[PDB]
Amino acid sequence: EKHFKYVILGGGVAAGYAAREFAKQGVKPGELAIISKEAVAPYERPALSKGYLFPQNAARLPGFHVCVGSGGERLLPEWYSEKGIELILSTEIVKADLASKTLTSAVGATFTYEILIIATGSSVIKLSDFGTQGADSNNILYLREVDDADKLVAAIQAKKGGKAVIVGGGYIGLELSAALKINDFDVTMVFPEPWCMPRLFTADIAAFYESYYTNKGVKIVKGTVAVGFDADANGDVTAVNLKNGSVLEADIVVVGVGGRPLTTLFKGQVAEEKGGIKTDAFFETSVPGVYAVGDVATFPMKMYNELRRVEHVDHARKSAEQAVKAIKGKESGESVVEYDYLPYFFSRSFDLGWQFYGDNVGDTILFGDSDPTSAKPKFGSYWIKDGKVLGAFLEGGSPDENKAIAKVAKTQPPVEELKKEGLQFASKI
Ligand SMILES: Cc1cc2nc3c(=O)[nH]c(=O)nc-3n(C[C@H](O)[C@H](O)[C@H](O)COP(=O)(O)OP(=O)(O)OC[C@H]3O[C@@H](n4cnc5c(N)ncnc54)[C@H](O)[C@@H]3O)c2cc1C
Ligand SMILES: NC(=O)c1ccc[n+]([C@@H]2O[C@H](COP(=O)([O-])OP(=O)(O)OC[C@H]3O[C@@H](n4cnc5c(N)ncnc54)[C@H](O)[C@@H]3O)[C@@H](O)[C@H]2O)c1
Ligand SMILES: O=C1O[C@H]([C@@H](O)CO)C(O)=C1O
């Protein structure tokens, strides 16, 4: 049995950034452990669908450990022991007793905390969860964690010049379709929605990304779903059967059909809401000295006066810091400012990349060009509700331009021929 004042449960983005803030706020050797089922120190998960997958000059660990991702220092394993932070790796926690402030591994081992941070992130939805016929075949791969990414790199090696099917039109599908395409696959994307990223992209924005993908050789199948997979004698996938009756041959299938907060260790013991562990503006759960951060938290969103959950890296980094800042700033009394999150989301693929700040509500306008034959494409969109601008999106922006639209989203300036001098409106705020 081991005892620590501070236990982080999860070896991910929030955990790494929590650790860095622990060290900034003067934590003393032996006081803090991070417990993780992964076999490596925390890292910048976004790299797994991008740089990790390049055919040359690829991100590899220890390169992308936190906090490089945001311009910070790179925390390698030796950083942690050097500071007496305990990296407890290859360790799945299967039982969590908030009552005893006690955690039990899979090996039966036992761990106590005074102060717990919950950063167990999100699961991957698998087609096997649904009982889909043949979803258990080989080379049907998911991508959450670096071992998944190493399995994806090996199948890419073994199957080059073959056929890839990407099941899903969210973030994963977008990036993984591009990455497979860059690694010399014939790629088809499959998804049921009217157009990709429908939770963020308008019809206009989606049509751009769809033409560009089409122009790059990616085939897109919409309005349907994978209802099953054929396999060969060895059990390797050979095709994807669709609900519309077509069959798509395949050597690799990559599925990105969403994620859920990894909260099962705590069902009952903590107030939940919108799928996540409910928290206040400091990331403390219903249970005193128990914190929840990153993808798992539902927390108050001051600036839209609402409870929200978000599944995004910027937020994992900051909520981790917030919680650490709220712990130490009650240890020594004083006071801490509440979390004030400006939503910030982004993605990159091929030569493209975009940013979104704010809330995607009310009516939209596009601006800039816009043309799928480049170059380099530079357009955006403003979301206007109640006269004010509420959200903005920008593809191919410079840093000045990106600070600009962020400043707009934060300030919510009012109104209207915005479509003439559109990017320009953001710079005059
Ligand atoms: C491939 C990919 C790309 C992404 N790209 C972007 C992007 O470009 N931009 C963006 O904004 N967001 C992106 N995200 C979103 C995501 O929010 C961040 O990647 C981030 O990881 C969230 O961090 P977290 O700490 O909350 O959870 P995680 O980083 O997932 O950390 C959870 C850690 O806890 C461990 N764990 C979980 N449960 C247990 C348990 N019961 N016992 C022991 N250990 C456990 C897990 O193994 C993991 O180590 C991406 C996500 C993925 C998967
Ligand atoms: N840039 C980024 O922000 C980024 C990049 C990669 C991953 N991620 C994160 O990783 C997690 C997983 O992402 P994801 O793209 O897998 O989920 P997502 O929630 O982004 O995508 C959900 C999509 O899956 C599709 N889908 C759902 N059920 C389906 C089915 N039965 N058949 C076919 N398609 C189906 C839908 O069209 C939907 O748009 C999320 O937390 C996400 O935020 C984020
Ligand atoms: O700007 C970003 O891109 C990186 C990613 O590739 C990791 O290095 C990341 O996480 C960001 O916040």
Numbering used by the authors: 4 to 418, 422 to 435
What did the article's authors report about this structure?
MDHAR reduces the monodehydroascorbate (MDHA) radical to AsA at the expense of an NAD(P)H molecule, with NADH being the preferred donor. We report, for the first time, the crystal structure of MDHAR of O. sativa L. japonica (OsMDHAR) to understand its detailed mechanism. All these proteins consist of three domains: an NAD(P)-binding domain, an FAD-binding domain, and a C-terminal domain, as shown in Figs 1 and 2.
To elucidate the detailed mechanism of the electron pathway adopted by OsMDHAR, we co-crystallized OsMDHAR with AsA, which is the final product of the enzyme, in the presence of NAD. We determined the structure of the catalytically compromised Y349F mutant in complex with AsA. Structural studies revealed three highly conserved residues, G72, R320, and R351, positioned closed to the AsA molecule. Therefore, we suggest that R320 is important for substrate binding. The structural and mutagenesis studies suggest that the electron is transferred from the flavin N atom to the FAD flanking Tyr349, which subdivides the distance between FAD and AsA into two shorter segments of 5.7 and 3.8 Å, and then directly to the substrate, MDHA.
